[PDB]
């Protein structure tokens, strides 16, 4: 068993991870559960231990993108998840409410709070086989939207109690951030569907004007796009993220350290290099220090800017290379939410791409 | 040769920066009635080689309204939490103004212990033999920090608004404490509009309009005297919007120690008590307090983790130093379900609709941010 499929998947926002779903005592897996998607790899060791091999084939996009008719793919590890143990000592009804609000992971480990600096390390192994036109994020620092923060059809942004949000959810169903009239699904004969428990299968009817906070660009992403390796930092100071504000820097086009800005957002390419110059068939180790932008919540102001530092190290052609590729740069990075940020690595295939992706990741540490 | 030096400068900590000339010993501002006798630097009652602070509320010195109908209360206190001009240096131009309207100025200042963060405190009190046994006063308290854009509509919806949305509301609603009223302009006795120093209308509360905003509530921790008892009292409120009508408050007199009086959302615990007559008089009593705050789930309104209270008491009587572990590391509910945390005050807060005179000294404050 040179490669061992790891097919267990956790909906980290809406479910606790079972102990049997946890990988190496510190990870859970998200995205498509194909056997090939994620495998423990004993043929590509790092620091004397198995690495994780991630693979998305052409047909492996399972998710919908923002664009019309666009798709995306995901096979990732999350360092943030909650377990049964995390709910001990909370009210009995806490887990159920957490499922509905999608706040389960709020109760788990691996969250860097708002405003708290943290250092991170991880290593990546890019096969020579990897296509230069891949469109994939291989490591990202993800935010945690405020789950009872809503916008009414009339345009008022407000945060509700959990109980009030549960009331709203009786007649509104949210698809991502977008509210729709809640209805029950019919079969192809026009007869109501019942689920495994005998309940109606709820479905999104017409859009009803409601919004809830959901999604948004990741504060920090390492990836490849358009024949470029890139590191991109995003900031969003708006209390309720506006998903229609598509402030996103292009690795291809946007010059290094020249932020693309809207009223509320900023998107900075902190570093880039041609794909051809990225070392292949060797472990590349990144050491990342992050000082998050701080925000004023309902005031929507940036209190203090952030900072990013990145060192890159690898051994290639009988030479060890160490490059200070992000040299302690003042940068806007984070999201205006209550909760902070969590680390993921693997494959997140974006930009409406089905170009195959396969590489390995290992050696993660945060402190 | 100084004896007593009046400190009459007062700061509206929630709605104003403290001027440099209002700051006492580089670390305090004063709140409450500004009578000369209310607060004085006292060179006749030294503590650790330094002047203490003498606080005094006479019978006529209640200047505040209590919750109860026709009830009054009094205040002369120091706050360790306040904002200064320096705190707003380099901020957006309109930041201070919005902070004044929302009553969030002190959010930008020093002396805040964040939600969930443990902290140690120390202070000393000197109770004269003259102090009447039926005083009703809090001499040290740990105060919370309400969410200032958290409102309730006339229809009963609890919601937190953006600052901009709250500013819009504030155009036509004026809040008196937590209670919203139609905003109107005040007239003189002839029925002619008053103009302020800059020629603007003087705003006034008209009829109640159904709106509420978060304000007030019991202090998370209070040291005081009531009904002939010295007491330490811990309060917890897990409701997202504090309900002021929920009068969950323990009395030292009859409530047994460490047995909370509870509502659905609140708890009030007498952590310790002793008869007034047994409290040492005419000497400095030093308290060392360690606090672990209860943590709360914000809009979920649950208690995440309980808190803890430890209190040591030390003084010298006629013959020996006495040290008593009066609150021995007690698991306890203590805090408030708000975004912001807690700040220290000491002095006189005369509660329970009392006008019994109060005079004592306080000194020797330290918080070790640990
Ligand atoms: Ca947000
Ligand atoms: Ca509150």
Quote the minimal CA–CA distance from B124 to chain A in Å: 35
Instruction: Say yes or no for a CB contact (<8 Å) between A239 and B162.
Output: yes
Residue A262 and residue A216 in contact, taking contact as beta carbons nearer than 8 Å? no
Residue B348's alpha-carbon distances to B26, B79, B239, B276, in angstroms, are: 21, 12, 28, 17
User: Quick one: how far is CA A267 from the chain centroid?
Assistant: 16
Which residues have C-beta within 8 Å of that of residue A24, sequence separation ≥ 6?
A: none
Integer distance in angstroms from the first to the last C-alpha of chain B? 39
Report the C-alpha gap between A341 and A144 in whole angstroms: 6
Token pair for residue A118? 């943290």
For B4-146+217-367, give the CATH class.
mainly beta
With the C-alpha atoms ordered A205, A207, A212, A215, is the resulting torsion angle positive or negative? positive
The reply to whether A338 touches chain B by the CB within 8 Å rule is yes
Question: How far is residue A142 from each of residues A267, A322, B340, measured CA to CA in Å?
Answer: 14, 27, 25
Asked if A301 is an interface residue toward chain B (Cβ–Cβ < 8 A), one would say yes
HSE (CB half, 13 Å, CA atoms) of A327?
Answer: 4
Contacts of B299 in chain A (CB under 8 A): 148, 159-162, 165
Instruction: For residue A92, give the chain B residue with the closest CA.
Output: B302
**Inter-CA distances, A249 with A125, A256, A268, A345, A365, Å:** 25, 10, 6, 21, 28
Where do the domains of chain A lie?
A: 3-147+214-366, 149-212
Contact A159 B299 (CB under 8 A): yes
| Of A220, A224, A249, A236, the residue nearest A118 (C-alpha) | A220
Fold of the CATH domain A149-212: duf1285 like fold (3.10.540)
How far apart, in whole angstroms, are the C-alpha atoms of residue B238 and residue B164? 27
Interatomic CA distance for residues B108 and B96, integer angstroms: 10
Those residues whose C-beta lies under 8 Å from the C-beta of residue B344, and which sit 6 or more positions away, are: B79, B80, B81, B111, B121, B140, B141, B142, B143, B365, B367
**Distance (Å, rounded) from C-alpha A98 to C-alpha B151?**
24
Q: Which fold has domain A3-147+214-366?
A: Jelly Rolls (2.60.120)
CA distance A270 to A254: 10
Output the CA torsion B215→B218→B223→B226 (10° steps).
Answer: 120
- A298·B157 Cβ contact <8 A: no
What was the experiment behind these coordinates?
A: X-ray
Q: Which residues contact A49 (CB under 8 A, 6 or more apart)?
A: A362
Resolution of this entry in Å? Answer: 1.9
Q: Which residue of A has its CA nearest to B300?
A: A162
Q: How many CB pairs under 8 A join A and B?
A: 57
Q: What residues of B are in contact with residue A239 (Cβ under 8 Å)?
A: 162
State the Cα angle at A291 between A12 and A332, rounded to 5°: 90
Beta bridge partners of A343: A141
- Judged by a CB distance cut-off of 8 A, whether residue A24 touches chain B is no
Residue B366's CB is within 10 A of a number of other CB atoms, namely 9
In the 8-state DSSP scheme, what is residue A24?
A: T
Q: What distance in Å separates the CA atoms of residue B221 and residue B224, rounded to the nearest whole number?
A: 10
| CA of B238 vs chain A CAs: smallest distance (Å) | 12
CA distances, B18 to each of B37, B104, B216, B220, B263 (Å): 21, 13, 21, 25, 37
Residues of A whose CB is below 8 A from B166? 298
Dihedral pair phi/psi, residue B21, rounded to 5°: -75, -10
How far apart are the CA of A242 and the centre of ligand 1, in A?
Answer: 9
If you measure from the C-alpha of residue A241 to the centroid of ligand 2, how many angstroms do you get, rounded to a whole number? Answer: 24
Task: Note whether B39 and B76 are within 8 A (CB).
Answer: yes
b/e for B38-56, b at 16 or more Cβ within 10 A? bbbbbeebebeeebbbbbb
Task: Tell the CATH topology of B150-213.
Answer: duf1285 like fold (3.10.540)
From chain A, pick out residues whose CB is under 8 angstroms from the CB of B305.
89
3-state secondary structure of A165: helix
The answer to whether B159 contacts chain A (CB < 8 Å) is: yes
**Direct distance between the N- and C-terminal alpha carbons of chain A, in angstroms, rounded to an integer:** 33
Residues A35 and A63: their CA atoms lie apart, in Å, by 18
What is the spatial distance between Cα B222 and Cα B268, in angstroms, rounded to a whole number? 11
Give the helix/strand (H/E) hosting A29: strand A28-31
A210 touches B: beta carbon within 8 Å: no
Contact with chain A for residue B161, Cβ under 8 A: yes
Q: Which residue has the tokens 């110059």?
A: A277
CB contacts of B298 in chain A (<8 Å) are 338
Q: Which of B92, B158, B161 sits opposite A164 (nearest CB)?
A: B158
HEC string of B299-332 equals HHCCEEECEEEEEEEEEECCCCEEEEEEEEEEEE
CB contact under 8 A, A90 and B339: no
B24: which strand partners? B28
Q: Which are the residues after which chain A is interrupted (C to N > 2.5 Å)?
A: none
Instruction: Tell me if chain B has a CB within 8 Å of the CB of A239.
Output: yes
Radius of gyration of chain B (CA): 21
């Amino acid at each position: 068993e040179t490669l061992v499929p790891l097919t267990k998947r956790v909906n980290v926002q809406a479910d606790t991870a079972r102990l049997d779903q946890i990988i190496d005592g510190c990870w859970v897996a998200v995205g498509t559960n194909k056997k090939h998607a994620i495998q423990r790899d004993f043929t590509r060791l790092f620091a004397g231990k198995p690495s994780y091999r991630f693979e998305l084939r052409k047909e492996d996009n399972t998710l919908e993108g923002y664009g019309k008719g666009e798709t995306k793919g995901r096979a990732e590890f999350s360092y943030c998840y909650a377990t049964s143990a995390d709910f001990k000592g909370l009210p009995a009804d806490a887990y159920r409410k957490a499922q509905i609000t999608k706040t389960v992971y709020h109760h788990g480990k691996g969250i860097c709070p708002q405003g708290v600096s943290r250092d991170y390390e991880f290593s990546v192994y890019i096969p020579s086989a990897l296509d230069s036109n891949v469109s994939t994020i291989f490591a990202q620092w993800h935010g945690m939207p405020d789950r009872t923060l809503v916008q009414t059809p009339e345009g008022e942004v407000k945060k509700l109690t959990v109980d009030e949000f549960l009331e709203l959810d009786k007649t509104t169903i949210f698809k991502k951030n977008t509210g729709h009239e809640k209805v029950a699904k019919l079969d192809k004969q026009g007869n109501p569907l019942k689920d495994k428990k005998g309940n109606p299968v709820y479905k999104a009817g017409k859009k009803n004007g409601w919004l809830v906070e959901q999604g948004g660009y990741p504060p920090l992403a390492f990836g490849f796009s358009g024949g470029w390796f890139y590191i991109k930092a995003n900031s969003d100071r708006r209390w309720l993220t506006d998903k229609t504000d598509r402030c996103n820097a292009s690795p291809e086009k946007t010059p290094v350290m020249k932020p693309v800005t809207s009223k509320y957002k900023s998107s900075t390419i902190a570093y880039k290099m041609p794909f051809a110059d990225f070392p292949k068939d060797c472990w590349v180790t990144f050491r990342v220090h992050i000082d998050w932008t701080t925000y004023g919540k309902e005031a929507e102001n940036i209190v203090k800017p952030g900072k990013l530092d990145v060192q890159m190290e690898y051994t290639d052609k009988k030479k060890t290379v160490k490059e200070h590729i992000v040299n302690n740069e003042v940068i806007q990075i984070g999201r205006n939410d209550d909760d902070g940020y969590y680390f993921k690595f693997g494959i997140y295939r974006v930009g409406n791409s089905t170009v195959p992706v396969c590489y390995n990741l290992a050696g993660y540490k945060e402190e």
